[PDB]
Write a protein that binds this ligand. Structure first.
Ligand code: A1Z
Ligand code: FE2
Length: 216
């Protein structure tokens, strides 16, 4: 599917109506598996952090850590298919521009690659951008082959429009997810009992980002 068709016929109407959009089979099995291989190699060669401190504990031997991260620009050797994914995300957003709300998107973060180690940790309920830091759209790509949430957990639960009625999104292989980054979409990751990977980029709105500059 050409990016403009996906954008105009699906992403733009889904985002403006619901603030959330799920695209399955985004890149196809071959590219999806190559991204998986690159992320696993990052993991196996120690490129991730040790994980978010979950419980601090007076005996630090008992510390519990959760999601581990690494920031990826997309041009590093061994990361060029992650770079292909990132360019594919940009292609979609570029073909949306002027139609995602009244936002004018003019940049994005590097990719945050996340690894949940499977030790029963998740991610607490939160809003990505609660305080106007410039980020207007969250984009997540999942790469977990044959993920079964009834067995392994790890559901992303989003509370669309902030209301208590929630949407449960499995972190399925080759699934792409967009949602508004602000308080319209509080969300959380339920405990994961197997290794769970995801790649996130955030897109900036020009006006909000130009003002966040003075909030820094
Ligand atoms: O994995 C998923 O399906 C959902 N993940 C998130 O919702 C998330 N959100 C925010 C952050 C995050 C929040 C603050 C700082 C940084 Cl570097 C990352 C990490 C995160 O993993
Ligand atoms: Fe988040």
């Amino acid at each position: 599917l050409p990016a403009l068709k996906l954008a105009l016929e699906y992403i733009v109407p889904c985002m403006n109506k619901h603030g959330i959009c799920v695209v399955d089979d985004f890149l196809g099995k071959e590219t999806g598996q190559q991204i998986g291989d690159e992320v696993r190699a990052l993991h196996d060669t120690g490129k991730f952090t040790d994980g978010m401190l979950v419980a601090q504990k007076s005996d630090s031997s008992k510390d519990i850590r959760g999601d581990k991260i690494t920031w990826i620009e997309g041009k590093e050797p061994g990361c060029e298919t992650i770079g292909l994914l990132m360019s594919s995300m940009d292609d979609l957003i570029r073909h949306c521009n002027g139609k995602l709300g009244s936002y004018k998107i003019n940049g994005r973060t590097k990719a945050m690659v996340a690894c949940y180690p499977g030790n029963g940790t998740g991610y607490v309920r939160h809003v990505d951008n609660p305080n106007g830091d410039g980020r207007c759209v969250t984009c997540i790509y999942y790469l977990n082959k044959d993920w079964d949430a009834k067995v392994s957990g790890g559901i992303l639960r989003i509370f669309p429009e902030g209301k208590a009625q929630f949407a449960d999104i499995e972190p399925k292989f080759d699934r792409l997810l967009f949602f508004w980054s602000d308080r319209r979409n509080p969300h959380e990751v339920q405990p994961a009992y197997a290794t769970r990977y995801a790649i996130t980029v955030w897109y900036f709105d020009a006006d909000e980002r130009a003002r966040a500059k003075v909030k820094y």
